[PDB]
């Protein structure tokens, strides 16, 4: 009756999830653990291996920029792609496209980055991150070696990733979890909160049922994810703070317009 509908919803969200996001967590873990028969990644652990694998595992390449800014700029454009993938997914959530268009923008403005970090964990282990649709692996250590402005820019996403990955969620749990984040009825500037809260409540129930059936032995996996949602806010907060340090302490800082609009806050 109501639960059968909560399972149908969970499966719709998963089917749309697999459409919007090519590199699933299942595939990413298959590569990180070494379980794929379809090739293997190129490791970038120092400045020399970056050069050899620069044109490799890549997303007019003559930038003449410092390695730190080129990496950072590489991050910008995977985020640009991800913002588009998240938007395609958010529009597949039943009832989203019927929201006030300006409320949709607000939900995406304050939600994309929370979801990018969540899904970024699926590509991360304690040693690095899968990059370029699984073609490359960038060591966490190599990212800290960067200059002091950009050296503590990815470590935060690593700390959260290792902890979030301890929960052992799959693509089904993440599909609903992402939908709940997007449908937050407490995003600043929303004009019609109640219709957003009604959707999230129905999503939270599908998530709770999803977790009980999928992780029947992991008691309190729901209350743990509700806390992670709160963490993701402070994590993005500290992230936006760092960006303004760069924008203020760094020159020659080209930023993609889509991120300028999202970051305007």
């Amino acid at each position: 009756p109501e639960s059968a509908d909560l399972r149908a919803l969970a499966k719709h969200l998963y089917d749309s999830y697999i459409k919007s996001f090519p590199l699933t967590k299942a595939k990413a873990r298959a590569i990180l653990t070494g379980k794929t028969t379809d090739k293997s990644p190129f490791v970038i652990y120092d400045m020399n291996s970056l050069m050899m694998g620069e044109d490799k595992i890549k997303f007019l390449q003559e930038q003449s920029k410092e390695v730190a800014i080129r990496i950072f700029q590489g991050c910008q454009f995977r985020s640009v792609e991800a913002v588009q993938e998240i938007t395609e997914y958010a529009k597949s959530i039943p009832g989203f496209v019927n929201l006030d268009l300006n409320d949709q923008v607000t939900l995406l403005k304050y939600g994309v980055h929370e979801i990018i970090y969540t899904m970024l964990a699926s590509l991360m282990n304690k040693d690095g991150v899968l990059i370029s649709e699984g073609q490359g692996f960038m060591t966490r250590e190599f990212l800290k070696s960067l200059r002091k402005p950009f050296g503590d820019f990815m470590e935060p996403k690593f700390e959260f990733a290792v902890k979030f990955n301890a929960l052992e969620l799959d693509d089904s749990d993440l599909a609903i979890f992402i939908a709940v984040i997007i449908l937050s009825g407490d995003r600043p500037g929303l004009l019609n909160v109640k219709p957003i809260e009604d959707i999230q409540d129905n999503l939270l129930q599908a998530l709770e049922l999803q977790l009980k059936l999928n992780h029947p032995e992991s008691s309190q996996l729901f209350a743990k994810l509700l806390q992670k949602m709160t963490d993701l806010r402070q994590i993005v907060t500290e992230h936006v703070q760092l960006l303004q340090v760069i924008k203020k302490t760094e020159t020659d800082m080209s930023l993609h317009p889509l991120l300028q609009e999202i970051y305007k806050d």
Partner: peptide, 11 residues
């Protein structure tokens, strides 16, 4: 001027 809005309106 909203890029996010143009993304939201595309099919």
């Amino acid at each position: 001027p909203s890029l996010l809005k143009k993304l939201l309106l595309a099919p």
